[PDB]
Amino acid sequence: PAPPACDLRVLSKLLRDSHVLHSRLSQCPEVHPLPTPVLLPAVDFSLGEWKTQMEETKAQDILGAVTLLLEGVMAARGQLGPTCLSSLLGQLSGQVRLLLGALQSLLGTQLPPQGRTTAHKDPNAIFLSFQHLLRGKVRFLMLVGGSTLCV
């Protein structure tokens, strides 16, 4: 039984749901800067740097980034009330947990150190970071690597 992470439909579903949720975010006008900044992972990378790294380092970075993103979402959700943004962040946390489970089913549970981090205040930054993480390093690994991760 191949791990679910190596089924491309799961990642496409995650991307579609994240896009729909970010589109829905614009419909609630009560969005305001969070009282306390939260920690978000680092998603930027360069192709010249990307081709130098090995598969294991990439996988560890993916796991660390996803775990840190989930932790940031959970921390951010605590700053809100019963408002719309709380429900949106809860759905976002559910999707991030789905991504984390799919990744852990394939790459193990050996998380790396924290690594380079950054802070943000506006709630849109969390959704943008999740979209960047889905469209960038994760998809790059799952497409360029191909069968080396799974049979």
């Binding site: 191949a2 679910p4 089924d7 439909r9 799961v10 496409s12 579903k13 749901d17 809860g90 946390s93 559910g94 947990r97 789905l98 489970g101 799919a102 852990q104 089913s105």
Partner: protein, 395 residues
């Protein structure tokens, strides 16, 4: 948690998820049911166990069945091991336990609304439905069952798994569609749909069948003696025997190789009363297949639909009978009307009424007072036609 959900088996604690965003686990005990005695607990790989709000149901015997339904989607997570164990809190006994993966217990619901009718071909049935949970239509495998709607049954139900391939059966389009051929023509049908997740990523089992829906296949138009032909590739005319005490109208539809249906795909167009027998005619299109439908209203308020075999425009060209030149062993000669492919035309002949049909490839021939007759079938590698316009009797 109704009786239809007994398809689950082989575990003291059954569980099933219909849309992969909800969870419900139920177990039954034949013993007594003191209030507040059994409590269900659940826990993910790292968390304090929590208690699911339990409920109770009656059973045909003195026992009872308990059902737990998870409150929110946040409590059901895919791809994680879920540890379920009940507690007999009266005397501290872990009666049952189970480690569960939510992605492997899918029980999808059947398509709620079903729409179907006769297809483009006489024996083709097209089916379309709306998925109750479109968000997971990618991972769902469908199956179809159908049988005769007539009293009793000439055969048992047949089940076919939808290929969900490019053969005009796009199980996902958020509705779906598919086209199934091989069905018997001219008889009512009832069909049901069922779904099951594909074990590639999300496991599960088949759900319940949908409610049966009746479909009346139109059948074939041979019973009405349908036959269409064209004159010099300009207009197409159709003819059928006049059914007694019943008016009728003919429809036509054009299509390219885009044969895959999409909702109500056939766009029928009414014919015109040309001038027992019946007739129609319309300005046919070119380089495409045409479809002919004839409907007969035997009684007011009802109509029987009949469909004829589709054909290309150039395959049924009607050639008027040509002239004849003969002399009294016999000498045969003729003047082909449209000499585009005059040599490639079959001229069967009679002599006196039956006679051998000489091969094509010539404008004349020979045969070994008398009576004569002939016909002209447009038969060629590039163009085809029927036995149109059999000649009047000749000497």
């Amino acid at each position: 948690q109704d009786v239809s959900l007994l398809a689950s088996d082989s575990e003291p604690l059954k569980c099933f998820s219909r849309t992969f965003e909800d969870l419900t686990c139920f177990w039954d005990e034949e013993e007594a049911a003191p209030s507040g005695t059994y409590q269900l607990l659940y826990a993910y790989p790292r968390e304090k166990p929590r208690a699911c709000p339990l409920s109770s149901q009656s059973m045909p015997h003195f026992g009872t069945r308990y059902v737990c339904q998870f409150p929110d989607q946040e409590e059901v997570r895919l791809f994680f091991p879920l540890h379920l164990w009940v507690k007999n809190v009266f005397l501290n006994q872990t009666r049952t336990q189970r480690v569960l993966f939510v992605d492997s217990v899918g029980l999808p619901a059947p398509p709620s609304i079903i729409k179907a009718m006769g297809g483009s071909q006489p024996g083709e049935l097209q089916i379309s439905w709306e998925e109750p949970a479109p968000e997971i239509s990618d991972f769902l495998r469908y199956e179809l069952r159908y049988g005769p709607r007539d009293p009793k049954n000439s055969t048992g139900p047949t089940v076919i798994q939808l290929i969900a391939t490019e053969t005009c059966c796009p199980a996902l389009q958020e509705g779906g569609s598919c086209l199934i051929s091989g069905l018997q023509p001219g008889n009512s049908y009832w069909l049901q749909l069922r779904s099951e997740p594909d074990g590639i990523s999300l496991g599960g089992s088949w759900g319940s069948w949908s409610l049966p829906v009746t479909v009346d296949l139109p059948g074939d138009a041979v019973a009405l003696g349908l036959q269409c032909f064209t004159l010099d590739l300009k207009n197409v005319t159709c003819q059928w025997q006049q059914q007694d005490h019943a008016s009728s109208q003919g429809f036509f539809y054009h299509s390219r190789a885009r044969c895959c249906p999409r909702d109500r795909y056939p766009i029928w167009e009414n014919c015109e009363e040309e001038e027992q027998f019946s007739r129609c005619h319309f300005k046919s299109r070119n380089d495409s297949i045409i479809h002919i439908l004839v409907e007969v209203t035997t009684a007011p308020g009802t109509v029987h639909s009949y469909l004829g075999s589709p054909f290309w425009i150039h395959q049924a060209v009607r050639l008027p009978t040509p002239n004849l030149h003969w002399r009294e062993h016999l000498e045969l000669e003729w003047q082909h009307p449209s000499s585009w492919a005059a040599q490639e035309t079959c001229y069967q002949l009679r002599y006196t009424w039956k006679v051998l049909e000489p091969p094509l490839g010539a404008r004349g021939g020979t045969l070994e007072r008398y009576r004569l007759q002939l016909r002209a079938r447009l038969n060629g590698p590039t163009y085809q036609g029927p036995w149109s316009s059999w000649s009047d009797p000749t000497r």
